[PDB]
Amino acid sequence: ASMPQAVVLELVGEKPPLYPARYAHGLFFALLSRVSPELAQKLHEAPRKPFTLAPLPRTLKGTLRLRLTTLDDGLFAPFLRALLEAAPDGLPLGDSSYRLARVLATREGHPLAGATSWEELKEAPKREKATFRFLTPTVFATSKPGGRTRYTPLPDPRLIAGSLLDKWQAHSPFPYNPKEEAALRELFELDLEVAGFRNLRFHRVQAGKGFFPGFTGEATLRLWSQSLEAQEALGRLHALAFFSGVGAKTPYGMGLAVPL
Amino acid sequence: MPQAVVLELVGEKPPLYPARYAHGLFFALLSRVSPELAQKLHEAPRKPFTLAPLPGPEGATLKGTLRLRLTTLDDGLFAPFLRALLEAAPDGLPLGDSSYRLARVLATREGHPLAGATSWEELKEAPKREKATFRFLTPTVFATSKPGGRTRYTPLPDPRLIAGSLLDKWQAHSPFPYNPKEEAALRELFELDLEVAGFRNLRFHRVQAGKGFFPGFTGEATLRLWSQSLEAQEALGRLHALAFFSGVGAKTPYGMGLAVPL
RNA sequence: GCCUCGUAGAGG
RNA sequence: AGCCUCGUAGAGG
Numbered sequence: 279a280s281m282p283q284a285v286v287l288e289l290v291g292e293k294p295p296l297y298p299a300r301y302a303h304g305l306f307f308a309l310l311s312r313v314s315p316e317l318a319q320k321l322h323e324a325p326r327k328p329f330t331l332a333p334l335p336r337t338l339k340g341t342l343r344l345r346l347t348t349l350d351d352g353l354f355a356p357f358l359r360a361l362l363e364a365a366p367d368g369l370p371l372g373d374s375s376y377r378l379a380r381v382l383a384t385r386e387g388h389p390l391a392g393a394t395s396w397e398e399l400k401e402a403p404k405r406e407k408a409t410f411r412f413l414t415p416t417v418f419a420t421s422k423p424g425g426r427t428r429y430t431p432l433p434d435p436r437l438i439a440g441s442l443l444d445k446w447q448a449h450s451p452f453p454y455n456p457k458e459e460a461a462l463r464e465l466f467e468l469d470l471e472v473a474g475f476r477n478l479r480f481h482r483v484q485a486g487k488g489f490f491p492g493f494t495g496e497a498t499l500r501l502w503s504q505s506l507e508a509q510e511a512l513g514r515l516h517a518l519a520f521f522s523g524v525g526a527k528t529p530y531g532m533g534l535a536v537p538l
Numbered sequence: 539m540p541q542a543v544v545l546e547l548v549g550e551k552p553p554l555y556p557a558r559y560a561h562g563l564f565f566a567l568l569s570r571v572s573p574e575l576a577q578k579l580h581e582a583p584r585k586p587f588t589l590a591p592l593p594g595p596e597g598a599t600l601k602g603t604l605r606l607r608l609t610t611l612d613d614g615l616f617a618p619f620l621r622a623l624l625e626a627a628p629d630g631l632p633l634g635d636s637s638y639r640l641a642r643v644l645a646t647r648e649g650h651p652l653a654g655a656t657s658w659e660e661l662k663e664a665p666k667r668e669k670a671t672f673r674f675l676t677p678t679v680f681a682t683s684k685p686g687g688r689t690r691y692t693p694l695p696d697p698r699l700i701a702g703s704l705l706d707k708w709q710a711h712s713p714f715p716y717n718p719k720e721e722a723a724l725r726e727l728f729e730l731d732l733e734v735a736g737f738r739n740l741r742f743h744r745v746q747a748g749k750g751f752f753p754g755f756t757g758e759a760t761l762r763l764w765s766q767s768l769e770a771q772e773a774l775g776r777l778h779a780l781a782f783f784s785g786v787g788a789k790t791p792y793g794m795g796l797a798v799p800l
Numbered sequence: 801g802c803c804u805c806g807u808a809g810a811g812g
Numbered sequence: 813a814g815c816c817u818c819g820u821a822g823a824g825g
Contacts, residue, residue, distance in 0.1 A: 303825085325824055419822050422730045427814055428764070428821095431734055432694055437822085444822075468684050472693055474753070478740040486825070488813045491734070502688070502801095526823060561812085583811045681809050689801065690808090699809085706809075748812055750801060764814085788810065 280351030282521040283393040285383040286334065289342045289369060291376030298333040299531035300486045301371040302344050306331055309360035309369075310353075317356060326448040329353055330521075330528040334390070335414055342376065345390055345534070347521045349449040390536065394517070396451050402517040404510035407473055407500045410438070410519060414534040415481040415492025418525045429490065431480060433497035435470040438524060441533075442515035445522040458507070465501075465508040473500035485530035492532050540711075540783035541616045541655040543645040544592065545606040545623075547631055547638035552602060556591040557747055557793030559633030560606050564589055567622035568615075575618070584710040586611030588783075588790040590676055592652070604638065607652055607796070609783045611711040652798065654782070661779045662714050666771035669735055670761045670778035672700065672786070676796035677743040677754025681788045691752060691788075693742060695759035697732040700786055700797075704777035707784040716773075724773050731765035747792035754787075754794055 295301045306329075311318035321327060328349035333342055348354045361369075361378070368375030385392035390413075410433075418437040420430040430437060443462060447453045454462065478495035485492075501512055516537045522528075524535035553559050564587075569576035579585055592605035610616040623631070623640065630637030647654035652675075672695075680692045680699040692699060705724060709715050716724065739757040763774055778799045785795035 322825080325818070325822095327824075421819085421821055421823085423820060424730070426730060426764075426820090428733055429814085432737075434694070440822080468686075468688060471690050472753070474742045474744075475740075476742070478737075480734075480737045480740075484813095486813095488815070488825095490814090491736070529824080558812095580812080583805070585811075683806085683808055683810085685807055687806095691801085702809080749803075750812095752801080789812095791811080 280354075281393045281395050282347065282349050282399070283354060283383065284345060284347045284391045284521060285381060286388045286391050287344045287346070287369075287378060287382075288380035289344065289371065289376030290379040291340055291342070291368070291371070291374055293374060294339050295342055295371040295374075295376075297372065297484065297486075298342055298344075299331070299484065302331050302333060302342075302531075303486060303529060305369055305371055306346070306357075309364055310356055312360045312363065313356040317352065321353070326445070327529055328449040330523040330533070332414055332523075332528070332531045332534045341379075342371065347523065349521060394521075399517045399521075400450075400452050400514055402510070402513035404506065405501075405513045405516055406509060407498055408512050408516040409496060409498040409538040410516070410524070411496050411536040411538055412494045412524065412534065413536060414531055415483045415485075415490070415494055416525050416533045416535060417490050417492040417527065431491040431493045432478075433472065433475060433493065435472055435499045436467050438497075438499060439466045439470060439512070439515060441525045442518055442522060443511075446515060446518055449522065450518075462508065462511055465503050465505060469501050469503035469508070471500050471502070473498035483532065485527040485532045490527060490532065492527075496538065539613060539655050539657050540609065540611050540661075540780075541645060542607065542609040542653050542783060543616070543620075543643060544650040544653045545608065545640065546642040546644070547604045547606065547633075548600075548641045549602045549604065549638035550636055553604060553634045553636070553638075555746060556604060556633065557589070560589050560591060561748075561792055563631065563633050564608070564619070567626055568619060570626075571618045571622040575615075584707065585791055586711045587615055588785040588795070590785075590790075590793045590796045593675065609785070611707075611783060652796075656779075656783065658713055661776055661783075662712070664772075664775040664779040666768060667774040667778055668763055668771060670774050671758060671800045672761075672778070672781055673758045673798045673800050674756050674786070674796065675798060676794055677745045677752070677756055678787050678795045678797065679752050679754035679789070691754075693753040693755045695734065695737060695740075695755060695757075697734050697759075697761045698729050700759070700761065701728045701732055701774070701777060703786050704781060704784065705773070708777060708780055711784070720769070724770060727765055727767060727770045731763050731767075731770065733762045733764060735760035735762035745794065747789040747794050752789060752794065758800065
């Protein structure tokens, strides 16, 4: 209903989108604004957006699979409307139209789709360790004093957690109070460590108009704090990843993380 | 001269804790010949050497054969060792339950690629770099302990920590240490201008070293300086070069941190 | 993830 | 398009 969700769309068309990540971004806003141009404009401007847009990796040429997550309540409905209204004439990526061959909103329909209530997410079993699968290049913006554009394309436990928290606070109905948030970032930069990782890989990808370095693979974060407040906070964020994504550029295909 | 010698030891059975036993032999031998050295070294918190049992395109090892890579960081350390080693050899070189047999002393880059000798001045005069690639041949880890007696390891190629370590070493052993200001200038630049440019064949490991088990990574990692400061570009050159002799990170005396500049 | 140095990186 | 906006560490197009 007004729950976070993930859906996957097969866009079967004649040729591969020249810039799937980018064109998918356009398709989204074009769609979303057919219905409500205020939502489009206001959303567009937001520094923190409650949605992700990711061409899934690894299909046939001419076909594209888009994962769309949403955190807001008012985002899904207009999209659904535009989609239903849009679908019959095909959805346009760039200068071609693709046929909505499939819509996979069911967990059983695709392992990367489904929904959950904020209450479920929030009542996630507490964790002392959390593994993530980063399916598409994941990068953090680690900028510095001066005009210093800098990137961290590796699974820094602090930054991972940092994003999932920043994201939670921004888009969650049950946000922590400043004290708790402070006592979380603290317990993170104190008791978080890299328990391990599999199939790490470094990439340079066009995330929209530009190219960014990112990593993929799996990483396990461990938390030495027995402090129960921090433990179940990890549980919440670990679940949230499935919908919020991780780090920077989630609207452009990057940061597709998945809780293991 | 910081030298790097590979030692082939032949024995009955592959050693139980090679890195720990090797560590013991180094001092035992160093102590019999130069028993004041052994004491001083063991005291220092940054020892001017590395000891690492080697681990690809050299095919199958024979059961019982072992390779020790010894790198010395000051001109004093290597000379006696050989001498000590040499004398103890005919007897049988013992690490653990069993004695092994010195079969080769490979101290020339032509005998083993990880072997060789370079001059402090040569390192110093290493061409400046905008990018530095390293190949970590053995699990490499950093100690990033936090307040309150918390022990934390970062088994990742943190460009800060990779460079930071190499410097910290350069400062400890080199006859040409940066001054307290030249130094802190680099450290600020290193946090500010150092990025990860790429990496290859990264892999997590959990290994035995010292009195403990530690995590650590292996593979390649290209660093990149986004600054234009020649102070730093050259520093990168010096540090990139010393990696061959100094290692990178914690537990280099116990087999971790075998870094190699490509 | 034991001991030691003290804050963050290290030594056995 | 290591470019633009935000200005301190992380983000948005």
